[model samples]
Target: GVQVETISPGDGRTFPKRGQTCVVHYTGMLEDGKKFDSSRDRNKPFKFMLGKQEVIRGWEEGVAQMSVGQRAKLTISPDYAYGATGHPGIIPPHATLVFDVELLKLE
Candidate 1:
């Protein structure tokens, strides 16, 4: 299960529906509070097309509920984050993930 907890709500009229490329800034961390990936650290926002397996189900699922300019925390369980074989370098097997995301744009 996943929870999309809004830190700051967005003022946009709609959420990213389909095929729209969504832009965001995010920091990924393990449930134990260790940081992993962060787009903000690189000073670049990440963008991706929706309705595709461009990322894990956790990211895609939680992001669907966000609107542009929205900032939120996505607490995703192991089932949606990664299976036994998680990201080899940063994530451990079946790791629960915490993502802080700010939806910047959708085009």
Candidate 2:
């Protein structure tokens, strides 16, 4: 099961719909607490078009549940993540992922 818990709850009612580009600042980690990636560390937000499958499955589902200016923690199951093969050198096989994410903008 994947859970998205909103921390900020945002100011707008609009959620990210398909074909819209969502910008976010995020930190990604393994269930064991090992860091994998972070947009915050780069001082740049990550941008992806919703429903395009540009990222992992977990990201698509998780971010869809958020709104602009919202901050949330996503606890993602492996089925919604990299799955059995994993992300080479970044995520292990069948690993669950945790992400602290802030929805910066939508366009």
Candidate 3:
């Protein structure tokens, strides 16, 4: 559903459970390298409920495979992202996204 590449390995082999409240820090950019958002820039991490519709379809799926403390890039297609409609004024229609993410903790 998503393309994942490791930028930095995690502390160990731990992954958040399906329903875990996963806290993460991330920078989201367009495929062309246009930055849209960044949790790091705000010095705060975002949270999503895994296996729950707390966020985008691709986001939940991508973070599920991440290890705590891991740093990685996730390539999410429009099918798994904002889709054809996209986010008004922020995301172009049918946009693909690249996210540099770090799984911070489970809360």
Candidate 4:
């Protein structure tokens, strides 16, 4: 189950479509609140194309629900996220993930 909380709905009306590029800022964490990664901490946004498979399925599906300038929190299920085999050194096996995500742009 994915729990989505819209902190601030964006001004844009259109949702990002497949093959469109999305720019977002996010902080990734485990259920215990241990952080794994953050675009904000890096001082840059993360960019990826929708349906490109470059990011996890949760992100792909989740971000599609957002509009530009929106900020939301997503509680991702393992199946939609990293799953049983998580990112080594960053995420543990079968870990559930949480993310505070902000949609910055769509192109």
Candidate 5:
């Protein structure tokens, strides 16, 4: 089962700075705690270049706090995800997301 949480509010002050790569293991879920995806089950962590705008803004912002081998729980707004278009059936338009994440490696 998955757990749901609210967005950790922050000002522009805390937004992830550009050009950083962060690593993690993550589980994504709906507000109802329905799991959509999880890297833990795969026995691998997820990696991304933070603030590169290649991923959701929430991820770029959320992963910023993680150092190597850290874990985090992040909830994000759809505006920070796929926006109004969404990612087809996997993610709803305007849906918020919850991610249980562990940082495992970095560049």
Candidate 6:
């Protein structure tokens, strides 16, 4: 098991439990720091139902530890992210994702 040294530990917020819904805005970047996806484009924060495994394991586990307006940088492994199949052109099948995330709210 590895621990991520939180870049910005969202106001000491608690990670969402196994069944709570949470909303977050995020920027996905490659290892070289190139932006892939971002909620900024939508001009609004993205909403997600927590514990539903809606995104990726890294996001499911990471967003829980954030409060509204909290930000964090997560270095995630492929297994916990897109997995071996990956997300096609956006993510390499064997690559990892570096996420710049902001927890916007809980629902």
Tens digits of per-residue lDDT for model 6, 1-107: 11245555565645566666677778888889999999978878888887676778877776665666677787888888877898977888967788888776677
Off by over 4 Å in 2: none
* Whole-model lDDT per candidate: 0.89, 0.90, 0.90, 0.89, 0.68, 0.74
- Candidate 1 lDDT, tens digit per residue, 1-107? 88999999998587998788989999998877789989999999999888878878888889999988899999998889777888878788988899999999988
lDDT of 5 by residue, 1-107 (tens): 22323333323233234565565678888889999989889987677777667877777766775455455577788887777987888988888888887666556
Model 3 residue 38 lDDT score: 98
Query: How far is 75's C-alpha from truth in model 1 (Å)?
Result: 0.6
Model 1 poorest ten-residue lDDT run: 11-20
Instruction: Return the TM-score for each candidate structure.
Output: 0.94, 0.94, 0.95, 0.94, 0.75, 0.83
TM-score, candidate 1, is 0.94
Looking at model 3, which ten-residue stretch has the lowest summed lDDT? 10-19
Worst 10 residues of 6 by lDDT: 1-10
What tens digits encode model 3's per-residue C-alpha lDDT throughout 39-85?
99999889888888868988888888888899999999998998999
Q: List, residue by residue over 62-99, the lDDT tens digit for candidate 4.
A: 88989888999999998888788888878877888999
C-alpha root-mean-square deviation, candidate 3 = 1.0
Residue pairs in clash, model 3 = none
Model 5, TM vs. native: 0.75
Poorest lDDT segment (10 consecutive residues) of candidate 4:
86-95
